[PDB]
Amino acid sequence: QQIGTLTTETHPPLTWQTCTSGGSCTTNNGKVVLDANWRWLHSTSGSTNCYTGNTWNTTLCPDDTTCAQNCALDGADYEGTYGITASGNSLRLNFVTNGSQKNVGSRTYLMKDDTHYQTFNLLNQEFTFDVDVSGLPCGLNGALYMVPMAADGGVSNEPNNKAGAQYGVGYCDSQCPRDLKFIAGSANVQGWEPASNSGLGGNGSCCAELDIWEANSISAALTPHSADTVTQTVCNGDDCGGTYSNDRYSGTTDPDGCDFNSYRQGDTSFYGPGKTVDTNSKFTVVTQFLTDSSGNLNEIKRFYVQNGVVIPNSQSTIAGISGNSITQDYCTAQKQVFGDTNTWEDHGGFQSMTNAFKAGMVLVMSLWDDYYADMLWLDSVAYPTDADPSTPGVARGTCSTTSGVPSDIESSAASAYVIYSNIKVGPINSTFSGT
Ligand SMILES: OC[C@H]1O[C@@H](O[C@H]2[C@H](O)[C@@H](O)[C@H](O)O[C@@H]2CO)[C@H](O)[C@@H](O)[C@@H]1O
Ligand SMILES: *[C@@H]1O[C@H](CO)[C@@H](O)[C@H](O)[C@H]1NC(C)=O
Ligand SMILES: *[C@@H]1O[C@H](CO)[C@@H](O)[C@H](O)[C@H]1NC(C)=O
Ligand SMILES: *[C@H]1O[C@H](CO)[C@@H](O)[C@H](O)[C@@H]1O
Ligand SMILES: [Mg+2]
Ligand SMILES: [Mg+2]
Numbered sequence: 001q002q003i004g005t006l007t008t009e010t011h012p013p014l015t016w017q018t019c020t021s022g023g024s025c026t027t028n029n030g031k032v033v034l035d036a037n038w039r040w041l042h043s044t045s046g047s048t049n050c051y052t053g054n055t056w057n058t059t060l061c062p063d064d065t066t067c068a069q070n071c072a073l074d075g076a077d078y079e080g081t082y083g084i085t086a087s088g089n090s091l092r093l094n095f096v097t098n099g100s101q102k103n104v105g106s107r108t109y110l111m112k113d114d115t116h117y118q119t120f121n122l123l124n125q126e127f128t129f130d131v132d133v134s135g136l137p138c139g140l141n142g143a144l145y146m147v148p149m150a151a152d153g154g155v156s157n158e159p160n161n162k163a164g165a166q167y168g169v170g171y172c173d174s175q176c177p178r179d180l181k182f183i184a185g186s187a188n189v190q191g192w193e194p195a196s197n198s199g200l201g202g203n204g205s206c207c208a209e210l211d212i213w214e215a216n217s218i219s220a221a222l223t224p225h226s227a228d229t230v231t232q233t234v235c236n237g238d239d240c241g242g243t244y245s246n247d248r249y250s251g252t253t254d255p256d257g258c259d260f261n262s263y264r265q266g267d268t269s270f271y272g273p274g275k276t277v278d279t280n281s282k283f284t285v286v287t288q289f290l291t292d293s294s295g296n297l298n299e300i301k302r303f304y305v306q307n308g309v310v311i312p313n314s315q316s317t318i319a320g321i322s323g324n325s326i327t328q329d330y331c332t333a334q335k336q337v338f339g340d341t342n343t344w345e346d347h348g349g350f351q352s353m354t355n356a357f358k359a360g361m362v363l364v365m366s367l368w369d370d371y372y373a374d375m376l377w378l379d380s381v382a383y384p385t386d387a388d389p390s391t392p393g394v395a396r397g398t399c400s401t402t403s404g405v406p407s408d409i410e411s412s413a414a415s416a417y418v419i420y421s422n423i424k425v426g427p428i429n430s431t432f433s434g435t
Contacts, residue, residue: 001073003163004074006047006074007040009166011033014030014423015030020430021427030110031110033117033165034084034168035109036167037107037171038076038106039076044072050070050187056192065160068187082106090420091365093108093366093367105368110362115153120425121357121361122361124289125289130282130421131283131284132418134279134282135417138218138409139408141214141368142214143214143215144213145364147172148231150232151362152165153165153168153170172206174227174255176242177205179200184232189201195244198372203240206232208353208356212287218379219262219264219272219378221261221378222302224344225255226343227252227253228252228347230352235252259334263396265314266316272397283304284306286305287301288300288301288428297353298328300327305432318393319392320336328350337392365420367417369404369406374404379397379399383396
């Protein structure tokens with residue numbers, strides 16, 4: 001994609017902290033950038049749309065390459081159009097914004113400078129942030145996560161990609177998404193078809209994915225996802241696997257991940273409104289990436305801090321699945337007991353995530369509803385909706401099986417929002433303390 005020049009692109013500021021072993025921290029003045037899919041895409045010679053609604057202009061975009069040559073991503077009105085406001089240490093994303101057009105959700109990335117994403121290798125480190133999820137009902141997901149996107153947005157070896165990180169180009173994840181308009185410096189117009197549960201193009205954008213945080217006020221999940229190749233690869237149609245494929249597990253990535261949702265793991269009193277981690281108020285989320293003696297990831301721990309109290313992650317209470325952290329033993333046990341295919345292990349598990357960190361992870365902060373499964377996998381009394389909650393792994397939250405339909409919640413929860421704040425990174429136990 002080209003650089004549009006009709007609207008200035010100014011990245012809102014967001015500062016975050018790097019901490020020493022002793023708990024002393026210094027500030028980094030970063031910025032955030034909106035993902036390219038949300039932007040205006042128009043001709044390089046004027047305001048004619050290359051895409052709008054869910055269809056492409058086939059004169060400007062007769063194939064993937066010509067489309068990339070002809071089409072420019074332009075600047076974003078962060079607050080006015082997308083309901084994104086970044087001030088000091090805080091980033092707020094609103095669910096619905098009624099500007100000239102209705103906008104739903106957003107996906108943003110943390111930048112190092114105006115043309116490069118910040119990258120993170122968190123091995124032997126922890127990532128910590130504060131979050132307000134009190135305004136997120138059933139069906140919404142305030143996600144904070146990491147994917148090994150190219151730091152420059154792909155520009156270095158993609159001749160038709162001038163827009164790059166500056167315009168939020170380069171996304172990939174463990175679902176191998178085919179709804180992306182641009183992938184690896186080409187458009188995705190070839191094979192494009194409108195789809196109600198997303199449109200979808202001929203190709204998808206695959207990579208490993210570390211879902212540090214996927215949550216609303218009801219349920220939360222922590223989920224690493226492996227991949228054969230940890231950085232971006234391009235897949236072809238149904239061979240992609242993932243959410244938009246006829247065989248979900250036929251691709252090169254792990255679309256399910258090794259998840260820890262306290263409720264799914266049998267503790268229904270731990271996370272939620274009025275619960276131990278009380279989602280009616282702000283709290284701190286600490287995620288630690290522990291290694292073996294060879295420097296390979298072998299454990300992900302989680303702590304919360306609320307009201308100055310340090311709260312360890314809840315124990316899994318499911319018979320056959322013990323502990324309160326993500327480890328080799330936990331993942332093997334959980335997939336066996338829940339009867340879920342262990343694509344996590346198949347695509348390299350902890351070694352894959354180790355290599356993803358070594359490649360360098362970009363921080364993603366998003367707010368979304370789920371046109372595929374209504375977020376039921378996160379927060380439903382049963383997923384799939386016809387399964388027995390008596391079966392371990394079926395229940396994930398307290399939301400009804402009819403909850404989270406986009407057309408419903410985009411009206412009924414239009415005021416929903418999430419706030420991420422006070423991001424801190426450093427050695428183990430450097431970013432938090434309390435009773
Ligand atoms: O694609 C939707 C959603 O799937 C999540 O994996 C689910 C999986 O769909 C289900 O079959 C299994 O029983 O539970 C897992 C964990 O909830 C995946 O973790 C998400 O990233 C993804 O958005
Ligand atoms: C598609 O783009 C061409 C070339 O700019 C333009 O002439 C035409 O009006 C566009 N089509 C639509 C439906 O906007
Ligand atoms: C970090 O703090 C946790 C919680 O108190 C503790 O279990 C762990 O031993 C500590 N690790 C280090 C390296 O201090
Ligand atoms: C479009 O169709 C899909 C099924 O193909 C539905 O899930 C969605 O609600 C919409 O009607
Ligand atoms: Mg293509
Ligand atoms: Mg509440």
